[PDB]
Design a protein around this nucleic acid. Sequence first.
RNA 1: AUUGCGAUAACGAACGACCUUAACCACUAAUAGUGGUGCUAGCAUUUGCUGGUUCCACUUCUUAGAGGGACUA
RNA 2: GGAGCCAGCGAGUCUAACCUUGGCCGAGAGGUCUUGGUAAUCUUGUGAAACUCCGUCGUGCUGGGGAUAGAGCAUUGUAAUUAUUGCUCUUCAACGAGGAAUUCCUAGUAAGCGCAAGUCAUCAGCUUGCGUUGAUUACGUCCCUGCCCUGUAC
Lengths: 60, 125, 69, 201, 141
Amino acid sequence: PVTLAKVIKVLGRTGSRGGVTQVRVEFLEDTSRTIVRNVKGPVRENDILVLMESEREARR
Amino acid sequence: AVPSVQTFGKKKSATAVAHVKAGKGLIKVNGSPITLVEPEILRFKVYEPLLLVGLDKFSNIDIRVRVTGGGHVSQVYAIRQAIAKGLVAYHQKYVDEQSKNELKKAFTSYDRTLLIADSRRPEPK
Amino acid sequence: AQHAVILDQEKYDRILKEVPTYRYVSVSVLVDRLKIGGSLARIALRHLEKEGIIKPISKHSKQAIYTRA
Amino acid sequence: FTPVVLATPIPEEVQQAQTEIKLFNKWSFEEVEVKDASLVDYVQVRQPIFVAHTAGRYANKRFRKAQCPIIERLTNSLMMNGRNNGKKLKAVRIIKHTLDIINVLTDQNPIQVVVDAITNTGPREDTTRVARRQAVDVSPLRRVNQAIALLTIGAREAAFRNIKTIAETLAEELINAAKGSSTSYAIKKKDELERVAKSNR
Amino acid sequence: GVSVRDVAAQDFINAYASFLQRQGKLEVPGYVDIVKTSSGNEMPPQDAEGWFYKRAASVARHIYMRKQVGVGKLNKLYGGAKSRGVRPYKHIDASGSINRKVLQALEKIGIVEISPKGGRRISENGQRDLDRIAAQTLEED
RNA sequence: AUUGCGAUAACGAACGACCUUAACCACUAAUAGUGGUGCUAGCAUUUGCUGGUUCCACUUCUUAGAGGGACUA
RNA sequence: GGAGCCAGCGAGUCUAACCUUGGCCGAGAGGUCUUGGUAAUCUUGUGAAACUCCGUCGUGCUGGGGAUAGAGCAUUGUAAUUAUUGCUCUUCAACGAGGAAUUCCUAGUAAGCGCAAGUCAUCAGCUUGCGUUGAUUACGUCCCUGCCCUGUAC
């Protein structure tokens, strides 16, 4: 099922054309358990994502 | 003679001019009642400065407006501005400053363009 | 096949019983589920509205919207 | 009530609007609710307006367009192909008729049906080229943009070489997409994007 | 009181055209139903019988609201775009011969008269006539 | 950017890289505009409303010319 | 098809015949008698087009589209044949959204719509400028194209 997460920090642009932003996101159901994800569109702090897969981490 | 003011509004190349004086609430544009302004789909864009403050405010004053240039749409936006600016200018001189700012609070809450021209201009060469 | 452009007695009888069934009726609806041409549908609506079988809510020449009541 | 007579008599039906602003003087914004918490900040339905035409300028700051009312956002995307550019008054009339139809097919407050279609249609995962593809998450603003584009494109193609008018087909798209109905063009498109993303993640 | 300015345009015109036709004094040119009314048009007027009365009404109102007019300005007013085939569109003036006879006809029933400084101006009987139809059109509401 | 702190067998010197728009306000002038006045048409008749054609007042709108109005705040 | 009805930038004669209002004739193109202007003053409120409202048409290469072609009536010019341009009736072609490739563009901007000037006896689908209606999508990067800067006698 879906999981909501809140953007707490924006880290930088990535990808061969800069089309993707890396972001650090905090789970909304319980704080901590923070994970880092790749986001396609324009994004800001306090935005909410719908993580459809949870146990996966952005490349680095 | 009689308490009166005149004010103007702008949009792009339209220029509405309004006279306000004491009397019995009538509102005419180019000598015709405001209920006939055209196109029909935009007509509420002109009722805004009336319904937003309330009709009771107009019972003692006559508004008549002339609009001149521009196009069909741009001149509609001109007249609504001339009415709003005209109304506060009348209060500013002939009643207290308290009611004047009561009006402003209502207008600028809904849409800044009721008082201030948008200042966009054609791009130079 | 081709849409009908002159009204036979059978379809006239059909119209009067079927149209009160529909929630929403318009030129497009009569041409679709009945098989009359568009020039009949514009005539039918004016007749049925005059007769009181359908209720108008808006009219615009390029669109028309009538309801069950 | 307040009939307030004037030397130019304003019609009764306009005076009655003096108490609350309704869209096209017909439907209320009150009790419209964005049902997904993730989109509440990005679907302007809070400031009421009389008519879906405004001068407003929104291109100057990159998130500022999020404040534009959703109904006006929709009308803009009808003005699309080159033969229709700039013809906003044409588009406004189309919306006016569309909401009427939705108030008769089904019986909800029609502006509520629009909000459902938007929230229900935007993709929630996507892919990018690295050749190969990699799956990525999608931001809430882009979710709204995608929904609007898919809805009007589906309507436009359905009404080409038509008999139904634009208003008829746009109304049908919105209703089918507020349901989970795969018959709508937009629902099919969303599904393909997500299942491909699943394959590559 | 009431003035022509108090009534919607395509509501006054329909009413007055219907009235003017019933009186039967308005003299028609007789070549009606052949003429296109414009060199930019394709096909003649679609309302075969009524169209001459409709234009007579429109001209009367247009003069009433203005200081004076002449035939040339009317041709500009009723002009339109002509397709010019494969070349781009252009503005073209309407037929002169229609409009000239319209003004001559209205003058015989006394609605309009020749002005100094040229062109035509409204007669006082024209004012009195048009103001009466205006009142009836609102009252019918 | 040879655009600068500092360091110190160096010190002191030479080309390339100011002028007009947008935008607010005092001053002009009228061939532009507004209001009043005399006469006058229609409607209605609290004495109003929409127009036509002899003077008077003004400059806000228009005008065009001139004068002043961001330095990283 | 009928009705509604709104701009900005230009240019114009005595050197003589430019821009043309108004009246009359003609289905139209056009003709004819007078008139204002060497121009913020007159043409000119350049009453522009898209656009708005009410009707006819009904998904049929159809009333979409108007190439090719026949007959006739006018205008410029010393002269229109291989045909300047305009008008009227008739003829009614391809074209059902276009493969590989490829151009311009970040706000009063793209695109849609029209007008004036240039050349000029006549002759625009051209060039420049002006206004009317007015969006979608970024606010980034070095993946592609291209430019610039900071081991060795070669």
